[PDB]
RNA sequence: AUGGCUGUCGUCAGCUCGUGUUGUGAAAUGUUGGGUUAAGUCCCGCAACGAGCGCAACCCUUAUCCUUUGUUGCCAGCGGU
C-alpha cells in the first residue's frame, strides 16, 4: 500500500499548528508526518484528477526554479500536460488577459 | 478672462498610464533591493506583468579613406617659356 517508506525529511522548525492532525512527532528530533493518514489521501486526489483528465483538463503542474529543479525538470511534459518550472510570475493567472500580450511575444519571437 | 509665443527649475532624470495584487479608505506596488551607468542605461532578484512621455538613437557640423566630376579652382610628370 505504502509507496516506499523513505520520508526522513529535514525540516526542524516552523511547524504549523493548523496541520496537527496529520503529524506524528518524536522522530526527527522535531516532527514527522503520519504515514498511515496519507495512504487514503493521494488515493483520492488521483480519483478526482481523473475526472478533469477526461475532458483533457489543463493541470499546469508547478515548481519554482530550484524548489524541485532536478526533482521534476520536465517529467511533467506529456501529451496533455503543462508545467511552470522557472519563477512563477507573480499574478499571471489572475491577469491572464495581460499575459496574452507576452505569450504572443514568445510566439512571434 | 484669453490664443499664440517666450524665460526659469533644467538637457537635471525623472514623470505617468493600463490590467493585476494589498489596504475600510486617502493610497501602495510596479518605479523599491544587490551591481553598474552621463542616464528610470542595462543585468539579477522580487507581487507583479506591460506600455507611454523622457534618456540614448535617427539629424547637422567636424576629424581618415574611396568612387564620379575638373571651371572661374589646382600644377605632380613634360614642353615655349
Ligand atoms: Mg481592494
Ligand atoms: Mg518615482
Ligand atoms: Mg510610487
Ligand atoms: Mg537600484
Ligand atoms: Mg527607459
Ligand atoms: Mg616648366
mmCIF file of C-alpha atoms (C1' of nucleotides) and ligand atoms in Angstrom:
data_model
loop_
_atom_site.group_PDB
_atom_site.id
_atom_site.type_symbol
_atom_site.label_atom_id
_atom_site.label_comp_id
_atom_site.label_asym_id
_atom_site.label_seq_id
_atom_site.Cartn_x
_atom_site.Cartn_y
_atom_site.Cartn_z
ATOM 1 C CA UNK A 1 0.000 0.000 0.000
ATOM 2 C CA UNK A 2 2.704 2.460 1.044
ATOM 3 C CA UNK A 3 4.853 3.852 -1.768
ATOM 4 C CA UNK A 4 8.282 3.253 -0.228
ATOM 5 C CA UNK A 5 8.979 4.171 3.393
ATOM 6 C CA UNK A 6 11.657 6.833 2.957
ATOM 7 C CA UNK A 7 10.443 10.118 4.469
ATOM 8 C CA UNK A 8 13.379 11.017 6.710
ATOM 9 C CA UNK A 9 12.903 14.715 5.975
ATOM 10 C CA UNK A 10 14.977 17.632 7.261
ATOM 11 C CA UNK A 11 12.627 20.430 8.384
ATOM 12 C CA UNK A 12 13.024 21.070 12.115
ATOM 13 C CA UNK A 13 11.146 24.324 12.753
ATOM 14 C CA UNK A 14 8.046 26.366 11.922
ATOM 15 C CA UNK A 15 5.532 23.545 12.306
ATOM 16 C CA UNK A 16 2.092 24.941 11.533
ATOM 17 C CA UNK A 17 -0.379 24.139 14.350
ATOM 18 C CA UNK A 18 -3.259 24.028 11.855
ATOM 19 C CA UNK A 19 -1.970 20.698 10.465
ATOM 20 C CA UNK A 20 -1.526 18.948 13.835
ATOM 21 C CA UNK A 21 -3.931 16.093 12.954
ATOM 22 C CA UNK A 22 -1.609 14.723 10.233
ATOM 23 C CA UNK A 23 1.597 14.788 12.328
ATOM 24 C CA UNK A 24 3.156 12.048 14.475
ATOM 25 C CA UNK A 25 6.211 13.694 16.049
ATOM 26 C CA UNK A 26 9.016 12.138 18.093
ATOM 27 C CA UNK A 27 11.413 11.155 15.335
ATOM 28 C CA UNK A 28 13.404 13.869 13.534
ATOM 29 C CA UNK A 29 14.231 15.458 16.819
ATOM 30 C CA UNK A 30 11.410 17.636 15.675
ATOM 31 C CA UNK A 31 8.423 16.188 13.825
ATOM 32 C CA UNK A 32 7.245 13.878 11.055
ATOM 33 C CA UNK A 33 4.085 13.362 9.013
ATOM 34 C CA UNK A 34 1.954 10.304 9.745
ATOM 35 C CA UNK A 35 2.411 7.680 7.031
ATOM 36 C CA UNK A 36 -0.912 5.952 7.788
ATOM 37 C CA UNK A 37 -3.088 9.047 7.228
ATOM 38 C CA UNK A 38 -1.596 9.671 3.761
ATOM 39 C CA UNK A 39 -2.326 6.362 2.001
ATOM 40 C CA UNK A 40 -6.069 7.251 1.961
ATOM 41 C CA UNK A 41 -5.465 10.811 0.639
ATOM 42 C CA UNK A 42 -3.479 10.665 -2.593
ATOM 43 C CA UNK A 43 -5.557 7.645 -3.490
ATOM 44 C CA UNK A 44 -8.403 10.119 -3.762
ATOM 45 C CA UNK A 45 -6.553 13.048 -5.164
ATOM 46 C CA UNK A 46 -5.948 10.835 -8.211
ATOM 47 C CA UNK A 47 -9.621 9.827 -8.268
ATOM 48 C CA UNK A 48 -10.582 13.493 -8.569
ATOM 49 C CA UNK A 49 -7.804 14.229 -11.078
ATOM 50 C CA UNK A 50 -9.178 11.540 -13.398
ATOM 51 C CA UNK A 51 -12.446 13.431 -13.924
ATOM 52 C CA UNK A 52 -10.795 16.573 -15.287
ATOM 53 C CA UNK A 53 -8.267 14.418 -17.078
ATOM 54 C CA UNK A 54 -11.211 13.151 -19.109
ATOM 55 C CA UNK A 55 -12.002 16.366 -20.923
ATOM 56 C CA UNK A 56 -8.242 16.679 -21.219
ATOM 57 C CA UNK A 57 -8.147 19.114 -18.335
ATOM 58 C CA UNK A 58 -5.220 21.505 -18.051
ATOM 59 C CA UNK A 59 -3.389 20.593 -14.845
ATOM 60 C CA UNK A 60 -0.425 23.002 -15.080
ATOM 61 C CA UNK A 61 1.992 21.460 -12.596
ATOM 62 C CA UNK A 62 4.061 23.997 -10.638
ATOM 63 C CA UNK A 63 7.561 24.110 -9.200
ATOM 64 C CA UNK A 64 9.558 27.299 -8.728
ATOM 65 C CA UNK A 65 13.115 27.313 -10.116
ATOM 66 C CA UNK A 66 15.224 25.493 -7.501
ATOM 67 C CA UNK A 67 12.230 24.234 -5.485
ATOM 68 C CA UNK A 68 12.245 20.974 -7.466
ATOM 69 C CA UNK A 69 14.525 21.577 -10.472
ATOM 70 C CA UNK A 70 16.428 18.277 -10.506
ATOM 71 C CA UNK A 71 13.369 16.619 -8.968
ATOM 72 C CA UNK A 72 10.928 17.496 -11.797
ATOM 73 C CA UNK A 73 12.852 19.052 -14.694
ATOM 74 C CA UNK A 74 10.419 18.106 -17.475
ATOM 75 C CA UNK A 75 8.884 14.772 -16.419
ATOM 76 C CA UNK A 76 5.605 16.715 -16.421
ATOM 77 C CA UNK A 77 5.793 17.102 -20.208
ATOM 78 C CA UNK A 78 3.291 14.669 -21.731
ATOM 79 C CA UNK A 79 0.532 14.561 -24.339
ATOM 80 C CA UNK A 80 -1.844 16.851 -22.400
ATOM 81 C CA UNK A 81 0.268 18.212 -19.539
ATOM 82 C CA UNK A 82 1.883 21.590 -18.878
ATOM 83 C CA UNK A 83 4.137 22.959 -16.159
ATOM 84 C CA UNK A 84 5.823 26.018 -14.686
ATOM 85 C CA UNK A 85 9.453 25.277 -13.787
ATOM 86 C CA UNK A 86 11.036 28.743 -13.748
ATOM 87 C CA UNK A 87 9.843 31.516 -11.431
ATOM 88 C CA UNK A 88 6.052 31.572 -11.237
ATOM 89 C CA UNK A 89 5.309 35.110 -12.407
ATOM 90 C CA UNK A 90 3.557 36.924 -9.581
ATOM 91 C CA UNK A 91 -0.057 37.239 -10.646
ATOM 92 C CA UNK A 92 -0.179 35.766 -14.143
ATOM 93 C CA UNK A 93 -3.292 33.574 -13.878
ATOM 94 C CA UNK A 94 -5.413 36.398 -12.438
ATOM 95 C CA UNK A 95 -4.351 38.783 -15.228
ATOM 96 C CA UNK A 96 -4.016 36.166 -17.973
ATOM 97 C CA UNK A 97 -5.525 38.831 -20.235
ATOM 98 C CA UNK A 98 -2.330 40.807 -19.529
ATOM 99 C CA UNK A 99 -0.081 37.759 -20.074
ATOM 100 C CA UNK A 100 -1.571 37.104 -23.516
ATOM 101 C CA UNK A 101 0.465 40.075 -24.748
ATOM 102 C CA UNK A 102 3.631 38.270 -23.604
ATOM 103 C CA UNK A 103 2.645 34.806 -24.832
ATOM 104 C CA UNK A 104 2.062 36.435 -28.219
ATOM 105 C CA UNK A 105 5.529 37.950 -27.851
ATOM 106 C CA UNK A 106 7.008 34.491 -27.275
ATOM 107 C CA UNK A 107 5.108 33.049 -30.247
ATOM 108 C CA UNK A 108 6.164 35.807 -32.650
ATOM 109 C CA UNK A 109 9.733 35.709 -31.329
ATOM 110 C "C1'" A B 1 -10.562 86.433 -18.877
ATOM 111 C "C1'" U B 2 -7.544 84.582 -23.188
ATOM 112 C "C1'" G B 3 -4.962 82.211 -28.145
ATOM 113 C "C1'" G B 4 -0.220 82.315 -29.954
ATOM 114 C "C1'" C B 5 4.803 82.908 -28.453
ATOM 115 C "C1'" U B 6 8.772 83.061 -24.681
ATOM 116 C "C1'" G B 7 12.015 82.795 -19.733
ATOM 117 C "C1'" U B 8 13.393 79.583 -15.447
ATOM 118 C "C1'" C B 9 13.906 74.938 -12.292
ATOM 119 C "C1'" G B 10 16.859 72.180 -16.445
ATOM 120 C "C1'" U B 11 19.441 68.624 -21.006
ATOM 121 C "C1'" C B 12 18.520 67.519 -14.052
ATOM 122 C "C1'" A B 13 16.493 62.172 -14.890
ATOM 123 C "C1'" G B 14 12.895 61.784 -13.875
ATOM 124 C "C1'" C B 15 7.008 61.960 -14.705
ATOM 125 C "C1'" U B 16 2.973 58.673 -15.610
ATOM 126 C "C1'" C B 17 -0.986 55.091 -17.503
ATOM 127 C "C1'" G B 18 -3.306 50.004 -18.233
ATOM 128 C "C1'" U B 19 -4.812 45.407 -16.075
ATOM 129 C "C1'" G B 20 -3.156 42.561 -11.514
ATOM 130 C "C1'" U B 21 -2.497 42.472 -6.218
ATOM 131 C "C1'" U B 22 -2.557 44.824 -0.897
ATOM 132 C "C1'" G B 23 -5.430 48.358 2.370
ATOM 133 C "C1'" U B 24 -12.436 50.110 5.016
ATOM 134 C "C1'" G B 25 -10.087 54.468 2.776
ATOM 135 C "C1'" A B 26 -6.858 58.522 1.259
ATOM 136 C "C1'" A B 27 -3.327 55.328 -1.157
ATOM 137 C "C1'" A B 28 0.676 51.476 -2.034
ATOM 138 C "C1'" U B 29 3.029 48.173 -5.640
ATOM 139 C "C1'" G B 30 5.381 48.337 -10.185
ATOM 140 C "C1'" U B 31 9.071 52.906 -10.042
ATOM 141 C "C1'" U B 32 11.972 49.688 -4.180
ATOM 142 C "C1'" G B 33 16.617 45.876 -3.403
ATOM 143 C "C1'" G B 34 22.046 43.811 -4.955
ATOM 144 C "C1'" G B 35 25.614 45.691 -9.019
ATOM 145 C "C1'" U B 36 26.536 49.299 -12.954
ATOM 146 C "C1'" U B 37 25.902 53.805 -15.999
ATOM 147 C "C1'" A B 38 26.430 60.562 -18.183
ATOM 148 C "C1'" A B 39 21.275 58.474 -17.749
ATOM 149 C "C1'" G B 40 14.117 55.016 -14.637
ATOM 150 C "C1'" U B 41 21.189 52.941 -19.290
ATOM 151 C "C1'" C B 42 21.493 47.642 -18.614
ATOM 152 C "C1'" C B 43 21.682 42.777 -15.645
ATOM 153 C "C1'" C B 44 19.965 39.765 -11.276
ATOM 154 C "C1'" G B 45 16.257 39.400 -7.607
ATOM 155 C "C1'" C B 46 11.303 40.367 -6.334
ATOM 156 C "C1'" A B 47 3.900 40.680 -6.091
ATOM 157 C "C1'" A B 48 3.688 41.955 -10.417
ATOM 158 C "C1'" C B 49 3.183 41.686 -15.703
ATOM 159 C "C1'" G B 50 3.264 45.504 -19.858
ATOM 160 C "C1'" A B 51 3.191 50.229 -22.043
ATOM 161 C "C1'" G B 52 3.695 55.773 -22.741
ATOM 162 C "C1'" C B 53 6.445 60.761 -22.309
ATOM 163 C "C1'" G B 54 11.504 61.442 -21.130
ATOM 164 C "C1'" C B 55 17.438 59.336 -21.744
ATOM 165 C "C1'" A B 56 20.382 57.043 -25.909
ATOM 166 C "C1'" A B 57 19.422 56.676 -31.371
ATOM 167 C "C1'" C B 58 17.605 58.760 -36.195
ATOM 168 C "C1'" C B 59 19.500 64.996 -37.927
ATOM 169 C "C1'" C B 60 23.621 68.886 -38.963
ATOM 170 C "C1'" U B 61 28.903 70.002 -38.481
ATOM 171 C "C1'" U B 62 33.995 68.299 -37.685
ATOM 172 C "C1'" A B 63 38.376 64.566 -37.726
ATOM 173 C "C1'" U B 64 40.588 59.428 -42.003
ATOM 174 C "C1'" C B 65 39.943 56.941 -46.598
ATOM 175 C "C1'" C B 66 37.469 55.620 -51.515
ATOM 176 C "C1'" U B 67 34.192 56.483 -56.447
ATOM 177 C "C1'" U B 68 32.473 60.304 -60.001
ATOM 178 C "C1'" U B 69 33.219 65.200 -61.817
ATOM 179 C "C1'" G B 70 37.627 69.258 -63.171
ATOM 180 C "C1'" U B 71 35.907 75.512 -64.099
ATOM 181 C "C1'" U B 72 36.068 80.961 -62.817
ATOM 182 C "C1'" G B 73 39.889 76.217 -58.765
ATOM 183 C "C1'" C B 74 44.869 73.363 -58.728
ATOM 184 C "C1'" C B 75 50.379 72.300 -61.090
ATOM 185 C "C1'" A B 76 52.915 66.416 -59.650
ATOM 186 C "C1'" G B 77 55.448 64.464 -64.501
ATOM 187 C "C1'" C B 78 56.723 67.403 -69.777
ATOM 188 C "C1'" G B 79 57.392 71.294 -73.026
ATOM 189 C "C1'" G B 80 57.561 77.507 -75.408
ATOM 190 C "C1'" U B 81 58.518 79.978 -71.550
HETATM 191 MG MG1 LIG C 1 -9.222 46.357 -2.674
HETATM 192 MG MG1 LIG C 2 9.360 57.659 -8.737
HETATM 193 MG MG1 LIG C 3 5.159 55.182 -6.213
HETATM 194 MG MG1 LIG C 4 18.753 50.311 -7.859
HETATM 195 MG MG1 LIG C 5 13.573 53.545 -20.057
HETATM 196 MG MG1 LIG C 6 58.037 74.258 -66.820
#
